Design a protein around this ligand. Structure first.
Ligand SMILES: *[C@@H]1O[C@H](CO)[C@@H](O)[C@H](O)[C@H]1NC(C)=O
Ligand SMILES: *[C@@H]1O[C@H](CO)[C@@H](O)[C@H](O)[C@H]1NC(C)=O
Ligand SMILES: *[C@@H]1O[C@H](CO)[C@@H](O)[C@H](O)[C@H]1NC(C)=O
Lengths: 50, 89
């Protein structure tokens, strides 16, 4: 997908790898190489009125 | 030392952990759940120190169980027993 990846403070459990939401949308993900918990959030979007 | 067996045969993969699943009257609580679904034999576990009670029953509390090992072994597991170790004085 597409989204800004920053260092999140979500206390992920060792056996856990992903993090979903109400709509089953992945919000956080664990880096496979290094033990780090990121977060998937879109950069910017919105409507355009003329 | 081992006393529950004397021999073996051909079998599947074996997994091994380096630590253990283990005034002094404060009791413990070692909960386990052995579930067999879609072939994978899942095992859950959680430890918590409990206060020593008089009837020695299940404490009035709530504690979640976390997975610790998964084994894709098992064909017909509709039976089981338990094993204990007595201290020979
Ligand atoms: C990833 O693999 C490379 C291969 O040489 C190794 O140098 C590096 O330390 C590894 N990193 C992790 C986090 O396992
Ligand atoms: C050894 O392999 C055979 C293969 O047919 C299997 O049937 C058996 O369950 C295995 N384990 C034994 C004999 O302990
Ligand atoms: C498992 O064992 C039970 C009783 O021994 C039997 O009724 C059942 O068919 C067996 N299932 C398989 C898959 O062997």
């Amino acid at each position: 997908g597409t989204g800004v990846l920053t260092e999140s403070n979500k206390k992920f459990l060792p056996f856990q790898q992903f993090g979903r939401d109400i709509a089953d949308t992945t919000d956080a993900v664990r880096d496979p190489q290094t033990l780090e918990i990121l977060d998937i959030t879109p950069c910017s979007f919105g409507g355009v009125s003329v | 030392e081992f006393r529950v067996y004397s021999s073996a045969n051909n079998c599947t993969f074996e997994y091994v952990s380096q630590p253990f699943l283990m005034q002094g009257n404060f009791k413990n609580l070692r909960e386990f759940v052995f579930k067999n679904i879609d072939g994978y034999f899942k095992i859950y576990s959680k430890h918590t120190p409990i206060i020593v009670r008089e009837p020695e029953d299940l404490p009035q509390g709530f504690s979640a169980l976390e997975p610790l090992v998964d084994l894709p072994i098992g064909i017909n597991i509709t039976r089981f027993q338990t094993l204990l170790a007595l201290h020979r004085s």
